Amino acid sequence: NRRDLRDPDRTVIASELVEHSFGVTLDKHVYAALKFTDEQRTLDIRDYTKQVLMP
Amino acid sequence: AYLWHRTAFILAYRTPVVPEGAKAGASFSANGVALRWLADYDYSQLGDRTLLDV
């Protein structure tokens, strides 16, 4: 604040300190799902890793 | 009676691969044919299920 010097009005204006906040939330569930029949896993998949997991 | 040459009839067998999601089952033999045994628990029906296939 600010006041004149040698001023007969000698009151001081008090200041204020206000803190703030904001909230972070978990809200989503990302996923990738696959399904393979027994025949598809026996006679169709050669390398499980590079053919299923990596994609 | 049947009289046949070796090349008359052909058989082929394949043991199914136990998947990753199933509890590791055993593997039996029926006259030299390898059979896959697989057990799964049905919580909804509160009972065990077994399957032996080829």
Side-chain angles (χ1 to χ4, degrees):
Chain A
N1 293 93
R2 220 183 300 163
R3 45 174 312 271
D4 298 340
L5 208 73
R6 278 173 207 275
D7 190 20
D9 182 23
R10 328 202 53 81
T11 190
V12 289
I13 304 139
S15 315
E16 269 92 1
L17 293 149
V18 178
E19 270 166 328
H20 299 90
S21 61
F22 61 93
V24 190
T25 314
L26 270 192
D27 48 28
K28 212 64 68 186
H29 174 216
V30 181
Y31 70 99
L34 285 157
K35 54 177 163 201
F36 290 101
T37 74
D38 262 0
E39 300 105 358
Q40 273 205 43
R41 178 87 197 68
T42 311
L43 320 164
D44 273 314
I45 289 188
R46 323 175 279 272
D47 176 278
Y48 181 80
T49 295
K50 76 182 289 295
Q51 191 171 1
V52 177
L53 278 175
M54 300 200 320
Chain B
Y2 303 98
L3 168 76
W4 74 84
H5 192 247
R6 196 197 73 260
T7 54
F9 310 114
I10 290 179
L11 270 294
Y13 294 110
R14 280 300 305 257
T15 296
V17 173
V18 163
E20 288 86 21
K23 193 188 188 187
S27 179
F28 295 83
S29 294
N31 271 257
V33 183
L35 311 172
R36 162 195 85 162
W37 187 78
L38 180 143
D40 186 74
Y41 184 74
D42 199 355
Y43 187 103
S44 53
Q45 295 289 315
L46 286 174
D48 206 42
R49 312 168 280 183
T50 67
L51 173 75
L52 182 88
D53 55 354
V54 66

PDB file of all heavy atoms in Angstrom, chain A residues 36-39 41-45 48 52, chain B residues 14-20 36 38 51 53:
ATOM      1  N   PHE A  36      -8.852 -65.751 -29.289  1.00  0.00           N
ATOM      2  CA  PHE A  36      -8.371 -66.733 -30.251  1.00  0.00           C
ATOM      3  C   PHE A  36      -8.956 -68.096 -29.926  1.00  0.00           C
ATOM      4  O   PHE A  36      -8.796 -68.587 -28.808  1.00  0.00           O
ATOM      5  CB  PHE A  36      -6.842 -66.821 -30.232  1.00  0.00           C
ATOM      6  CG  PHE A  36      -6.158 -65.613 -30.784  1.00  0.00           C
ATOM      7  CD1 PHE A  36      -5.626 -64.659 -29.937  1.00  0.00           C
ATOM      8  CD2 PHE A  36      -6.047 -65.426 -32.150  1.00  0.00           C
ATOM      9  CE1 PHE A  36      -4.996 -63.542 -30.440  1.00  0.00           C
ATOM     10  CE2 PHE A  36      -5.416 -64.313 -32.659  1.00  0.00           C
ATOM     11  CZ  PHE A  36      -4.890 -63.368 -31.804  1.00  0.00           C
ATOM     12  N   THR A  37      -9.598 -68.719 -30.908  1.00  0.00           N
ATOM     13  CA  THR A  37     -10.107 -70.064 -30.703  1.00  0.00           C
ATOM     14  C   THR A  37      -8.948 -71.053 -30.599  1.00  0.00           C
ATOM     15  O   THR A  37      -7.804 -70.753 -30.953  1.00  0.00           O
ATOM     16  CB  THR A  37     -11.046 -70.465 -31.838  1.00  0.00           C
ATOM     17  OG1 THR A  37     -10.280 -70.750 -33.015  1.00  0.00           O
ATOM     18  CG2 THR A  37     -12.021 -69.343 -32.141  1.00  0.00           C
ATOM     19  N   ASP A  38      -9.253 -72.250 -30.095  1.00  0.00           N
ATOM     20  CA  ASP A  38      -8.218 -73.263 -29.922  1.00  0.00           C
ATOM     21  C   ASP A  38      -7.624 -73.680 -31.262  1.00  0.00           C
ATOM     22  O   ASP A  38      -6.413 -73.894 -31.374  1.00  0.00           O
ATOM     23  CB  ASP A  38      -8.785 -74.471 -29.180  1.00  0.00           C
ATOM     24  CG  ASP A  38      -8.476 -74.438 -27.698  1.00  0.00           C
ATOM     25  OD1 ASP A  38      -7.819 -73.477 -27.249  1.00  0.00           O
ATOM     26  OD2 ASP A  38      -8.895 -75.371 -26.980  1.00  0.00           O
ATOM     27  N   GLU A  39      -8.465 -73.799 -32.291  1.00  0.00           N
ATOM     28  CA  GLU A  39      -7.961 -74.088 -33.628  1.00  0.00           C
ATOM     29  C   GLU A  39      -7.079 -72.956 -34.136  1.00  0.00           C
ATOM     30  O   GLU A  39      -6.041 -73.201 -34.760  1.00  0.00           O
ATOM     31  CB  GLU A  39      -9.130 -74.331 -34.578  1.00  0.00           C
ATOM     32  CG  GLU A  39     -10.010 -75.500 -34.175  1.00  0.00           C
ATOM     33  CD  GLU A  39     -11.327 -75.057 -33.569  1.00  0.00           C
ATOM     34  OE1 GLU A  39     -11.537 -73.835 -33.433  1.00  0.00           O
ATOM     35  OE2 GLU A  39     -12.150 -75.930 -33.220  1.00  0.00           O
ATOM     36  N   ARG A  41      -5.265 -70.989 -32.351  1.00  0.00           N
ATOM     37  CA  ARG A  41      -4.012 -71.004 -31.609  1.00  0.00           C
ATOM     38  C   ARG A  41      -3.147 -72.206 -31.951  1.00  0.00           C
ATOM     39  O   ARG A  41      -1.920 -72.130 -31.835  1.00  0.00           O
ATOM     40  CB  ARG A  41      -4.301 -70.983 -30.102  1.00  0.00           C
ATOM     41  CG  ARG A  41      -3.077 -71.051 -29.203  1.00  0.00           C
ATOM     42  CD  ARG A  41      -2.512 -69.664 -28.940  1.00  0.00           C
ATOM     43  NE  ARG A  41      -1.149 -69.701 -28.423  1.00  0.00           N
ATOM     44  CZ  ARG A  41      -0.087 -70.095 -29.114  1.00  0.00           C
ATOM     45  NH1 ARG A  41      -0.184 -70.480 -30.376  1.00  0.00           N
ATOM     46  NH2 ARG A  41       1.104 -70.093 -28.526  1.00  0.00           N
ATOM     47  N   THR A  42      -3.756 -73.303 -32.398  1.00  0.00           N
ATOM     48  CA  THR A  42      -3.023 -74.507 -32.762  1.00  0.00           C
ATOM     49  C   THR A  42      -2.504 -74.459 -34.197  1.00  0.00           C
ATOM     50  O   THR A  42      -1.304 -74.632 -34.430  1.00  0.00           O
ATOM     51  CB  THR A  42      -3.915 -75.736 -32.573  1.00  0.00           C
ATOM     52  OG1 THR A  42      -4.524 -75.691 -31.278  1.00  0.00           O
ATOM     53  CG2 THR A  42      -3.100 -77.006 -32.693  1.00  0.00           C
ATOM     54  N   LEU A  43      -3.390 -74.223 -35.166  1.00  0.00           N
ATOM     55  CA  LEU A  43      -3.065 -74.368 -36.579  1.00  0.00           C
ATOM     56  C   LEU A  43      -2.893 -73.041 -37.308  1.00  0.00           C
ATOM     57  O   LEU A  43      -2.665 -73.044 -38.520  1.00  0.00           O
ATOM     58  CB  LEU A  43      -4.145 -75.194 -37.280  1.00  0.00           C
ATOM     59  CG  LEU A  43      -4.702 -76.403 -36.533  1.00  0.00           C
ATOM     60  CD1 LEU A  43      -6.003 -76.854 -37.169  1.00  0.00           C
ATOM     61  CD2 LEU A  43      -3.693 -77.533 -36.522  1.00  0.00           C
ATOM     62  N   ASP A  44      -2.987 -71.919 -36.619  1.00  0.00           N
ATOM     63  CA  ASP A  44      -2.957 -70.653 -37.345  1.00  0.00           C
ATOM     64  C   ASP A  44      -1.887 -69.694 -36.853  1.00  0.00           C
ATOM     65  O   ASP A  44      -1.368 -68.905 -37.646  1.00  0.00           O
ATOM     66  CB  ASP A  44      -4.331 -69.974 -37.270  1.00  0.00           C
ATOM     67  CG  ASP A  44      -5.266 -70.425 -38.371  1.00  0.00           C
ATOM     68  OD1 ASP A  44      -4.833 -70.472 -39.539  1.00  0.00           O
ATOM     69  OD2 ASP A  44      -6.438 -70.728 -38.070  1.00  0.00           O
ATOM     70  N   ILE A  45      -1.543 -69.735 -35.570  1.00  0.00           N
ATOM     71  CA  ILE A  45      -0.540 -68.846 -35.000  1.00  0.00           C
ATOM     72  C   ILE A  45       0.801 -69.563 -35.006  1.00  0.00           C
ATOM     73  O   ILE A  45       0.945 -70.633 -34.403  1.00  0.00           O
ATOM     74  CB  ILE A  45      -0.927 -68.409 -33.578  1.00  0.00           C
ATOM     75  CG1 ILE A  45      -2.102 -67.433 -33.627  1.00  0.00           C
ATOM     76  CG2 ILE A  45       0.254 -67.767 -32.878  1.00  0.00           C
ATOM     77  CD1 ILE A  45      -2.427 -66.810 -32.295  1.00  0.00           C
ATOM     78  N   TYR A  48       3.580 -66.553 -31.488  1.00  0.00           N
ATOM     79  CA  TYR A  48       2.579 -65.806 -30.737  1.00  0.00           C
ATOM     80  C   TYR A  48       3.018 -64.369 -30.494  1.00  0.00           C
ATOM     81  O   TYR A  48       2.212 -63.440 -30.610  1.00  0.00           O
ATOM     82  CB  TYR A  48       2.285 -66.502 -29.411  1.00  0.00           C
ATOM     83  CG  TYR A  48       1.239 -65.796 -28.581  1.00  0.00           C
ATOM     84  CD1 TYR A  48      -0.111 -65.944 -28.857  1.00  0.00           C
ATOM     85  CD2 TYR A  48       1.602 -64.975 -27.524  1.00  0.00           C
ATOM     86  CE1 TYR A  48      -1.068 -65.299 -28.103  1.00  0.00           C
ATOM     87  CE2 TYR A  48       0.654 -64.326 -26.766  1.00  0.00           C
ATOM     88  CZ  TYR A  48      -0.679 -64.492 -27.060  1.00  0.00           C
ATOM     89  OH  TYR A  48      -1.624 -63.843 -26.301  1.00  0.00           O
ATOM     90  N   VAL A  52       0.806 -61.464 -32.211  1.00  0.00           N
ATOM     91  CA  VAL A  52      -0.316 -61.084 -31.364  1.00  0.00           C
ATOM     92  C   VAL A  52       0.083 -59.963 -30.413  1.00  0.00           C
ATOM     93  O   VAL A  52      -0.567 -58.912 -30.369  1.00  0.00           O
ATOM     94  CB  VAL A  52      -0.843 -62.296 -30.577  1.00  0.00           C
ATOM     95  CG1 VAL A  52      -1.953 -61.872 -29.639  1.00  0.00           C
ATOM     96  CG2 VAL A  52      -1.324 -63.374 -31.526  1.00  0.00           C
TER      97      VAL A  52
ATOM     98  N   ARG B  14      -3.386 -84.252 -34.490  1.00  0.00           N
ATOM     99  CA  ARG B  14      -2.788 -83.005 -34.020  1.00  0.00           C
ATOM    100  C   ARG B  14      -3.246 -82.775 -32.588  1.00  0.00           C
ATOM    101  O   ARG B  14      -4.448 -82.723 -32.318  1.00  0.00           O
ATOM    102  CB  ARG B  14      -3.178 -81.832 -34.915  1.00  0.00           C
ATOM    103  CG  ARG B  14      -2.375 -81.737 -36.198  1.00  0.00           C
ATOM    104  CD  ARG B  14      -0.892 -81.572 -35.920  1.00  0.00           C
ATOM    105  NE  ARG B  14      -0.621 -80.431 -35.055  1.00  0.00           N
ATOM    106  CZ  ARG B  14      -0.144 -79.269 -35.475  1.00  0.00           C
ATOM    107  NH1 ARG B  14       0.122 -79.052 -36.752  1.00  0.00           N
ATOM    108  NH2 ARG B  14       0.070 -78.298 -34.592  1.00  0.00           N
ATOM    109  N   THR B  15      -2.298 -82.651 -31.677  1.00  0.00           N
ATOM    110  CA  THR B  15      -2.645 -82.340 -30.300  1.00  0.00           C
ATOM    111  C   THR B  15      -2.838 -80.837 -30.152  1.00  0.00           C
ATOM    112  O   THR B  15      -1.918 -80.068 -30.452  1.00  0.00           O
ATOM    113  CB  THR B  15      -1.557 -82.831 -29.355  1.00  0.00           C
ATOM    114  OG1 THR B  15      -1.476 -84.257 -29.435  1.00  0.00           O
ATOM    115  CG2 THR B  15      -1.876 -82.429 -27.927  1.00  0.00           C
ATOM    116  N   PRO B  16      -4.008 -80.379 -29.712  1.00  0.00           N
ATOM    117  CA  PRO B  16      -4.214 -78.938 -29.544  1.00  0.00           C
ATOM    118  C   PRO B  16      -3.248 -78.349 -28.528  1.00  0.00           C
ATOM    119  O   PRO B  16      -2.899 -78.980 -27.528  1.00  0.00           O
ATOM    120  CB  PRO B  16      -5.665 -78.840 -29.060  1.00  0.00           C
ATOM    121  CG  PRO B  16      -6.299 -80.103 -29.508  1.00  0.00           C
ATOM    122  CD  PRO B  16      -5.234 -81.146 -29.444  1.00  0.00           C
ATOM    123  N   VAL B  17      -2.816 -77.124 -28.800  1.00  0.00           N
ATOM    124  CA  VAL B  17      -1.891 -76.423 -27.918  1.00  0.00           C
ATOM    125  C   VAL B  17      -2.669 -75.846 -26.744  1.00  0.00           C
ATOM    126  O   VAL B  17      -3.679 -75.157 -26.932  1.00  0.00           O
ATOM    127  CB  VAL B  17      -1.144 -75.320 -28.682  1.00  0.00           C
ATOM    128  CG1 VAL B  17      -0.316 -74.479 -27.726  1.00  0.00           C
ATOM    129  CG2 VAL B  17      -0.261 -75.927 -29.758  1.00  0.00           C
ATOM    130  N   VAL B  18      -2.206 -76.131 -25.531  1.00  0.00           N
ATOM    131  CA  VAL B  18      -2.809 -75.564 -24.328  1.00  0.00           C
ATOM    132  C   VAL B  18      -2.555 -74.061 -24.338  1.00  0.00           C
ATOM    133  O   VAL B  18      -1.396 -73.631 -24.427  1.00  0.00           O
ATOM    134  CB  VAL B  18      -2.254 -76.221 -23.056  1.00  0.00           C
ATOM    135  CG1 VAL B  18      -2.556 -75.363 -21.843  1.00  0.00           C
ATOM    136  CG2 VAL B  18      -2.841 -77.611 -22.881  1.00  0.00           C
ATOM    137  N   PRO B  19      -3.591 -73.234 -24.253  1.00  0.00           N
ATOM    138  CA  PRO B  19      -3.397 -71.786 -24.386  1.00  0.00           C
ATOM    139  C   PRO B  19      -2.725 -71.196 -23.158  1.00  0.00           C
ATOM    140  O   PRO B  19      -2.467 -71.868 -22.157  1.00  0.00           O
ATOM    141  CB  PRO B  19      -4.821 -71.246 -24.559  1.00  0.00           C
ATOM    142  CG  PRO B  19      -5.679 -72.451 -24.823  1.00  0.00           C
ATOM    143  CD  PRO B  19      -5.012 -73.585 -24.128  1.00  0.00           C
ATOM    144  N   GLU B  20      -2.431 -69.899 -23.255  1.00  0.00           N
ATOM    145  CA  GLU B  20      -1.749 -69.207 -22.165  1.00  0.00           C
ATOM    146  C   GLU B  20      -2.693 -68.943 -21.000  1.00  0.00           C
ATOM    147  O   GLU B  20      -2.270 -68.953 -19.839  1.00  0.00           O
ATOM    148  CB  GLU B  20      -1.147 -67.897 -22.673  1.00  0.00           C
ATOM    149  CG  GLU B  20       0.066 -68.077 -23.566  1.00  0.00           C
ATOM    150  CD  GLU B  20      -0.311 -68.305 -25.015  1.00  0.00           C
ATOM    151  OE1 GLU B  20      -1.442 -67.940 -25.401  1.00  0.00           O
ATOM    152  OE2 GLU B  20       0.521 -68.850 -25.769  1.00  0.00           O
ATOM    153  N   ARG B  36      -4.838 -83.842 -25.479  1.00  0.00           N
ATOM    154  CA  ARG B  36      -4.691 -82.691 -24.600  1.00  0.00           C
ATOM    155  C   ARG B  36      -5.785 -82.733 -23.543  1.00  0.00           C
ATOM    156  O   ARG B  36      -6.971 -82.819 -23.876  1.00  0.00           O
ATOM    157  CB  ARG B  36      -4.770 -81.379 -25.376  1.00  0.00           C
ATOM    158  CG  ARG B  36      -5.055 -80.192 -24.481  1.00  0.00           C
ATOM    159  CD  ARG B  36      -5.476 -78.978 -25.272  1.00  0.00           C
ATOM    160  NE  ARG B  36      -6.903 -78.991 -25.564  1.00  0.00           N
ATOM    161  CZ  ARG B  36      -7.598 -77.924 -25.929  1.00  0.00           C
ATOM    162  NH1 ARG B  36      -7.025 -76.737 -26.049  1.00  0.00           N
ATOM    163  NH2 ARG B  36      -8.897 -78.048 -26.178  1.00  0.00           N
ATOM    164  N   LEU B  38      -7.456 -80.620 -20.348  1.00  0.00           N
ATOM    165  CA  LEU B  38      -7.582 -79.238 -19.910  1.00  0.00           C
ATOM    166  C   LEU B  38      -8.710 -79.138 -18.898  1.00  0.00           C
ATOM    167  O   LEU B  38      -9.819 -79.613 -19.153  1.00  0.00           O
ATOM    168  CB  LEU B  38      -7.844 -78.317 -21.107  1.00  0.00           C
ATOM    169  CG  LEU B  38      -7.999 -76.821 -20.860  1.00  0.00           C
ATOM    170  CD1 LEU B  38      -7.357 -76.033 -21.988  1.00  0.00           C
ATOM    171  CD2 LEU B  38      -9.468 -76.470 -20.740  1.00  0.00           C
ATOM    172  N   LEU B  51     -11.746 -81.461 -20.245  1.00  0.00           N
ATOM    173  CA  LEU B  51     -11.867 -81.736 -21.670  1.00  0.00           C
ATOM    174  C   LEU B  51     -10.599 -82.427 -22.144  1.00  0.00           C
ATOM    175  O   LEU B  51      -9.499 -81.903 -21.950  1.00  0.00           O
ATOM    176  CB  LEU B  51     -12.099 -80.441 -22.453  1.00  0.00           C
ATOM    177  CG  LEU B  51     -12.091 -80.533 -23.975  1.00  0.00           C
ATOM    178  CD1 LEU B  51     -13.372 -81.158 -24.473  1.00  0.00           C
ATOM    179  CD2 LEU B  51     -11.901 -79.157 -24.574  1.00  0.00           C
ATOM    180  N   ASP B  53      -9.045 -83.918 -25.609  1.00  0.00           N
ATOM    181  CA  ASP B  53      -9.359 -83.793 -27.026  1.00  0.00           C
ATOM    182  C   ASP B  53      -8.130 -83.946 -27.917  1.00  0.00           C
ATOM    183  O   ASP B  53      -6.986 -83.948 -27.456  1.00  0.00           O
ATOM    184  CB  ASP B  53     -10.030 -82.449 -27.323  1.00  0.00           C
ATOM    185  CG  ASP B  53      -9.209 -81.269 -26.847  1.00  0.00           C
ATOM    186  OD1 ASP B  53      -8.174 -81.487 -26.184  1.00  0.00           O
ATOM    187  OD2 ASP B  53      -9.596 -80.120 -27.144  1.00  0.00           O
TER     188      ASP B  53
END
